[PDB]
Design a protein around this motif. Structure first.
Motif, PDB file in Angstrom:
ATOM      1  N   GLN A   1       0.835  -1.195   0.000  1.00 50.87           N
ATOM      2  CA  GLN A   1       0.000   0.000   0.000  1.00 50.87           C
ATOM      3  C   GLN A   1       0.869   1.244   0.000  1.00 50.87           C
ATOM      4  OE1 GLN A   1      -2.408  -1.551   3.566  1.00 50.87           O
ATOM      5  NE2 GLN A   1      -3.804  -0.013   2.705  1.00 50.87           N
TER       6      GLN A   1
ATOM      7  N   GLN B   1      -6.173  -7.049   5.879  1.00 45.87           N
ATOM      8  CA  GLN B   1      -7.225  -6.051   5.763  1.00 45.87           C
ATOM      9  C   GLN B   1      -8.487  -6.410   6.550  1.00 45.87           C
ATOM     10  OE1 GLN B   1      -6.992  -5.674   1.440  1.00 45.87           O
ATOM     11  NE2 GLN B   1      -8.665  -7.150   1.202  1.00 45.87           N
TER      12      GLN B   1
ATOM     13  N   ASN C   1      -7.056   1.844   5.209  1.00 46.08           N
ATOM     14  CA  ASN C   1      -7.087   1.822   3.749  1.00 46.08           C
ATOM     15  C   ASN C   1      -6.605   3.166   3.224  1.00 46.08           C
ATOM     16  OD1 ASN C   1      -8.111   1.729   0.913  1.00 46.08           O
ATOM     17  ND2 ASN C   1      -9.138  -0.130   1.653  1.00 46.08           N
TER      18      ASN C   1
ATOM     19  N   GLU D   1      -5.917   4.208   0.326  1.00 46.56           N
ATOM     20  CA  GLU D   1      -6.579   4.646  -0.901  1.00 46.56           C
ATOM     21  C   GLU D   1      -7.988   5.205  -0.730  1.00 46.56           C
ATOM     22  OE1 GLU D   1      -6.693   2.609  -4.743  1.00 46.56           O
ATOM     23  OE2 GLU D   1      -4.768   1.668  -4.243  1.00 46.56           O
ATOM     24  N   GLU D   2      -8.841   4.489  -0.004  1.00 49.22           N
ATOM     25  CA  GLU D   2     -10.216   4.935   0.207  1.00 49.22           C
ATOM     26  C   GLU D   2     -10.285   6.100   1.185  1.00 49.22           C
ATOM     27  OE1 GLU D   2     -12.169   1.141   1.428  1.00 49.22           O
ATOM     28  OE2 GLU D   2     -12.886   1.119  -0.649  1.00 49.22           O
TER      29      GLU D   2
END
Ligand SMILES: CC(=O)N[C@H]1[C@H](O[C@H]2[C@H](O[C@H](C)C(=O)N[C@@H](C)C(=O)N[C@H](CCC(=O)N[C@@H](CCC[C@@H](N)C(=O)O)C(=O)N[C@H](C)C(=O)O)C(=O)O)[C@@H](NC(C)=O)[C@@H]3OC[C@H]2O3)O[C@H](CO)[C@@H](O)[C@@H]1O
Length: 170
Positions: free
Chosen positions: A143, A159, A166, A168-169
């Motif tokens: 990540q 996860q 997270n 990215e989110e």
């Protein structure tokens, strides 16, 4: 914390130069893997760790083994650079996290249940002793940088753990 196998147990060499103190408590915890073979025998894991320290110092030109801690499929936690030292495992996160690597390659397979559980105990241990932030963010190597580490399958497992962040989110 006594369950942690110290550097002297895997015949570690002393760092080349003065290690850098890590500002505690860490906000992040990065999970990685070594991309080596895995083993349920302590003697083998010890061999892998000592050869990895050399790989990192002599083959990579670094100061010491890259991780803060390693987890073997024998269910043991091994001391790497330790709780208070800046690692060389994740570019852009070394000064603000602890690097925990599972000994093996987990692209398709998963570490043993005992290895997975001991890793969770290691995290609780750190939070409980004040080395890891109470609201720490648990992230994986892939990540942060382009790499298979800690292995696709292990990544899927992580996860689903509390504290998983997270990037990215968010
Ligand atoms: C199956 C797999 O995972 N493959 C990956 C492969 O996995 C490698 C595998 O890498 C594993 C997954 C690993 O744990 N890699 C980490 C150590 C790594 O290479 N991390 C770098 C960062 C390293 C780092 O932080 N270096 C410090 C070194 C600093 C030197 C000195 N000050 C010291 O403190 O030591 C640095 O530059 N820091 C600066 C100062 C900073 O943070 O500002 C990264 O994020 O890509 C290596 N195994 C071991 C035990 O080293 C080995 O060699 C190739 C392969 O097997 O890596 C390549 C990228 O190189 C990926 O593309 C592949 O997908």
């Amino acid at each position: 914390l006594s369950a942690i196998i110290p550097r002297s147990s895997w015949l570690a060499q002393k760092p080349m130069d003065e290690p850098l103190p890590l500002q505690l408590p860490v906000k992040y915890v990065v999970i990685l893997h070594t991309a080596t073979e895995s083993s349920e025998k302590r003697a083998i894991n010890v061999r892998l760790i000592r050869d990895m320290q050399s790989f990192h110092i002599e083959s990579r030109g670094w100061n010491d083994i890259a991780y803060n801690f390693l987890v073997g499929c024998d269910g043991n936690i091994y001391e790497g650079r330790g709780w208070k030292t800046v690692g060389a495992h994740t570019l852009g996160y070394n000064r603000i996290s602890l690097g925990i690597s599972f000994i093996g390659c987990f692209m398709k397979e998963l570490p043993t249940a005992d290895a997975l559980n001991m890793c969770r105990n290691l995290l609780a241990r750190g939070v409980e002793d004040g080395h890891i932030s109470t609201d720490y963010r648990l992230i994986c190597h892939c990540q942060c940088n382009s790499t298979e580490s800690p292995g696709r399958r292990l990544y899927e497992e992580i996860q689903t753990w509390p504290h998983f962040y997270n990037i990215e989110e968010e």
